[PDB]
Design a protein around this nucleic acid. Structure first.
Length: 364
RNA sequence: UGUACUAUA
């Protein structure tokens, strides 16, 4: 009986909030003969209520559907109407879906700059941006921005991250750490630098955090950061390297760090020159620390993985006068390690370490 | 022997 009515007489604002009414409208937008007609008729009636529909359990579906048919002028007017409410929209269960879809179908820079304006401090505080980055619903909007927009629009995200100690609030959060990684995967090198400075600054609250440890590891995979990050991290952590190797989360960073030293030095033998220099030094100094603390590391529930990584010839066979020092030091660690094998007979991983001293012997 | 992946009829 609803289908018997001319489109001109429909109560669109009433149908948008109704489930089956909304579905009916979406179906009309999908019927090519009536799509433009019903789009224009419904648009004029619902435009005072754009915010209301965006936040609505059924209305949000209509808004999403509309995004596939709206003219550039219609979409622009829509965004002009709701850009100051991006925070409230983003934390909303239904709003997040609407906004993602809107960002996903922008037609031009005018529209993008309007959304970005709404995320600026004129309408959304730094603290609110931090909230969005960690929010169950909002983090998806921030991600959409990251994958849809040019990094030249990332100001409000970068500004919020580097403010005071927000790097902690974000990197140690279950959603924020994921968001931060996606950002780093696509943003500009200079944007990476600014965030890395803050990450190094608050390293101790990050390196053994359940989520923060993934951030430190993510940085170690960015080659453009090698020229400073290796020396910078080692200098913050050297004095507690043994302790860090013996902790659940940071133990994985130590391994990642040791592997990275190996890949960099061996890549030279088989490639930035300055890195290599200090990478060789850090590696030698690391072997020394692990040699000194061998008795604790070989015995520790987490420390033994770091030790085994350092001892595995799969990682350093091209290295067999740095090669000279390395061979003496890694050889001596092997000797001392095997002397200790009977003192760990109990442990379930003794055979794994026996296998590595053996593999060393076969290679040498 | 050892760590994270989230949301609408």
């Amino acid at each position: 009986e609803i289908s018997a009515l001319p489109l001109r007489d429909l109560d669109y604002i009433k149908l948008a909030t109704d489930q089956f009414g909304c579905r009916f409208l979406q179906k009309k937008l999908e019927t090519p003969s009536e799509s433009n007609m019903v789009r224009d008729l419904m648009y004029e009636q619902i435009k005072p209520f754009f915010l209301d529909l965006i936040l609505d359990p059924f209305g949000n579906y209509l808004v999403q559907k509309l995004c596939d048919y709206l003219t550039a002028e219609q979409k622009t007017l829509l965004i002009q109407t709701i850009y100051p409410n991006v925070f409230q929209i983003s934390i909303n269960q239904y709003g997040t879906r609407s906004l993602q879809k809107i960002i996903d179908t922008v037609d031009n820079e005018v529209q993008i700059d309007l959304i970005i304006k709404g995320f600026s401090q004129e309408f959304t505080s730094i603290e609110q941006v931090v909230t969005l980055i960690n929010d169950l619903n909002g983090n998806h909007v921030i991600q959409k921005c990251i994958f849809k927009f040019s990094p030249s629009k990332f100001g409000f995200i970068i500004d919020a991250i580097v403010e005071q100690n927000n790097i902690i609030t974000i990197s140690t959060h279950k959603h924020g750490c994921c968001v931060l990684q996606k950002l780093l995967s696509v943003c500009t090198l200079q944007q990476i630098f600014k965030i890395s400075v803050k990450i190094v600054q608050f390293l101790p609250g990050l390196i053994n955090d359940q989520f923060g440890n993934y951030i430190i590891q993510f940085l170690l995979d960015i080659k453009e950061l090698d020229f400073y990050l290796l020396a910078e991290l080692f200098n913050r952590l050297s004095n507690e390297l043994c302790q860090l190797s013996c902790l659940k989360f940071s133990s994985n960073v130590v391994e990642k760090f040791i592997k990275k030293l190996f890949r960099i030095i061996t890549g030279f033998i088989v490639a930035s020159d300055d890195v290599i220099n200090a990478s060789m030094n850090i590696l030698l100094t690391t072997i020394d620390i692990f040699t000194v603390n061998l008795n604790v590391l070989i015995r520790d529930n987490f420390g033994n993985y770091a030790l085994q990584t350092l001892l595995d010839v799969k990682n350093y066979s091209p290295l067999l006068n740095f090669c000279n020092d390395f061979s003496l030091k890694i050889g001596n660690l092997i000797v001392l390690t095997k002397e200790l094998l009977p003192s760990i007979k109990t442990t379930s991983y003794a055979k794994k370490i026996k296998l590595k001293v053996k593999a060393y012997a076969e290679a040498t």
